[PDB]
Structure 1
């Protein structure tokens, strides 16, 4: 007997299997326990879902679909949608007051999708990731959504699951799933929980209460355009400038080199959470010299400090809107790989007067872990 929990993230998704009374987070074809929520299409109309799509973004900048979760379940003239379409490089068009994503696949072929249909493809990839590992079909799922999602967005997410061939047993809230993964459902009494979720592209803060082991979302805030990718892009810019100074060449003219640089920067960011120095290489088709420079933790911190500091403002705001002081917070839950960054851990701890965040689960996997726990309960 096997059921699944899926974190369907804005930038990254994750699948856990509940089997024999425990959760196993599953690695994809590339050995990665998170999969980008990215979709592209081959000229023959085949679906490229996850790493393959993300990894060709710079060469296919207008026909690589990502961030569909920003649009899912929303109306066209929603001010959120109208702001987000300014930043999305692929075509988003209106049909009957709803947003649709349009891509050119080649040879006079255009495909048009509701956000639900794109998210269904991402869910299918996660389903198939679990199935490839286990060597059997998986069907019954819990899928998570942001705590602020309304009934239409919850329905849209369920519909994406249904399209993907899943039996969506329940849609549950991301911060609640994370709280469950970290074991907060065992807490007794009345406690206040701050969930600090810094994803690849978004930042969500949720204030949850627990009362006799049962959660309630009291308030939510955040910054919809602050994420781990912003830290990567500032470092990429730093290295693009350094490359220009060393070689005289604009590395942006080499699209694959920029993509390779993004990987090196992501790897360096991960390394700098445990080490104090990391090497970043730039390989290019148009330059003989393989560029190679070190990035220190201190420089990584300097490049991003204002963004790191900006994460505290939504935390202040959620406390105000829940009539709570920082001293009323009993538990702190960190979600997202970016929360491994020591300076972020430092700032959160200092904000809460030295209070320790919960430990025990990879913060990129906590939401899928909790979803899988709940899938276990519900089956």
Structure 2
């Protein structure tokens, strides 16, 4: 019985895999503070976003894949590590954490996990972890290509022989999609919506291609400030998400351009694997296939691929 863990420190959700147990924590990456004292972290903090009274704030301390407010991020990490501690398990915890594909950035997560009891910290590139967790043959002399559409970044990589052949991190992912939905509601519906509503829209009717289905969305009228409800459809959702989807599609194309001939041949036969919260975006697989001519597969349990991948390393 071990306290070794692997952490996917996502901008929207944090998952922890514990050696010998598997995924033991999956919670929103949100911290609420009361005036500053930590009021709540994770599951109970998420619904506080956009809803805090005067004495309180609710913060997503990770943004674009790295750390924004250092103090709050550190409290978030310490909270989750403490929550999964097993007093029946061995000590000297080894912690693996993923990082997007700067030395400054790597150091921050590294030193940051040491403060919670991590005895030793190992860093893994996020797309490598995603690929391992999606079940790609990353150890073989064969090209595999992964696209991990995380909250803060989309990581595109070509893997072979336990290493990275090509990798790139683009700052477009789930957070940018939500923000595009928010901006769209403002311009097209004169409606100011919160982030939690934006995420609901993305999950319920988000699509990478025009179809459709509709849902009822509420918020604050743009000019007159009062509560209001509007109907939005998949077609509108598609228009909202077009720009960030195109940025994702374009990064994939750029990565393909960089692929060596023999690896290109391996990728021609099997295509691209999508992981991460964005992999669930309806039609994104079709959209990428249309622009590349390659098969596109959505991973099993795509939200968990990174944590499961780091978890595999942790067990070996």
Shorter-chain TM-score tier: 0.7 to 0.9
- Tell me which residue corresponds to 1:216: 163
- Tell me which residue corresponds to 2:5: 4
Counterparts of 2:225 and 2:251, CA distance in 1: 44
- Tell me which residue corresponds to 1:320: 257
Per-residue deviation, 1:240: 3.7
Q: 2:296 aligned with 1:296, yes or no?
A: no
Cα pair distance change 1:343/1:220, threshold 3 Å? same
Cα pair distance change 1:242/1:68, threshold 3 Å? closer
Per-residue deviation, 1:318: 2.4
Counterparts of 1:289 and 1:154, CA distance in 2: 43
One of 37, 43, 47 as aligned partner of 2:35 = 43
Per-residue deviation, 1:273: 6.2
Counterparts of 1:326 and 1:55, CA distance in 2: 47
TM-score for both structures, normalised by structure 1: 0.66
Counterparts of 2:218 and 2:78, CA distance in 1: 34
Per-residue deviation, 1:56: 3.2
Q: 2:203 aligned with 1:270, yes or no?
A: yes
- Tell me which residue corresponds to 1:24: 23
Q: Which runs of 5+ in 1 are unaligned?
A: 27-32, 73-87, 89-100, 102-114, 245-250, 253-257
1:97-108 matched pairs, under 5 angstroms: 101=69
One of 201, 211, 229 as aligned partner of 2:152 = 201
Deviations 1:179-217 (Å, cap 9, x if unpaired)?
A: 2112224774x21122212222322212222x3xxx111
One of 237, 244, 247 as aligned partner of 2:183 = 237
- Tell me which residue corresponds to 1:179: 131
Per-residue deviation, 1:297: 2.3
Deviations 1:291-328 (Å, cap 9, x if unpaired)?
A: 242x3323211222232122122223223344458654
Per-residue deviation, 1:43: 0.8
Q: Which moved more, 1:52-61 or 1:321-330?
A: 52-61
Is the 2:143–2:264 Cα contact (8 Å) retained in structure 1? no
**Number of aligned residue pairs:** 302
Q: Which runs of 5+ in 2 are unaligned?
A: none
Is the 1:201–1:228 Cα contact (8 Å) retained in structure 2? yes
Per-residue deviation, 1:157: 2.1
Deviations 1:219-273 (Å, cap 9, x if unpaired)?
A: 222422x2222222332333345654xxxxxx65xxxxx43xx323312322236
Is the 1:178–1:333 Cα contact (8 Å) retained in structure 2? no
Counterparts of 1:314 and 1:242, CA distance in 2: 28
Q: Which moved more, 1:234-243 or 1:62-71?
A: 62-71
Counterparts of 1:157 and 1:62, CA distance in 2: 23
Q: What is the alpha-carbon root mean square deviation over aligned residues?
A: 3.7
Q: 2:62 aligned with 1:67, yes or no?
A: yes
| 3-state SS of 2:37 partner | coil
One of 267, 276, 279 as aligned partner of 2:215 = 279
Deviations 1:312-358 (Å, cap 9, x if unpaired)?
A: 22223223344458654255232221121123111222344241325
Counterparts of 2:299 and 2:60, CA distance in 1: 34
- Tell me which residue corresponds to 1:76: none
Is the 1:327–1:352 Cα contact (8 Å) retained in structure 2? no
Counterparts of 1:68 and 1:228, CA distance in 2: 11
Is the 1:264–1:280 Cα contact (8 Å) retained in structure 2? no
Cα pair distance change 1:168/1:273, threshold 3 Å? farther
Q: 2:56 aligned with 1:120, yes or no?
A: no
| 3-state SS of 2:16 partner | strand
- Tell me which residue corresponds to 2:285: 345
Is the 2:9–2:97 Cα contact (8 Å) retained in structure 1? yes
Is the 1:205–1:220 Cα contact (8 Å) retained in structure 2? yes
Cα pair distance change 1:136/1:334, threshold 3 Å? farther
Is the 2:5–2:95 Cα contact (8 Å) retained in structure 1? yes
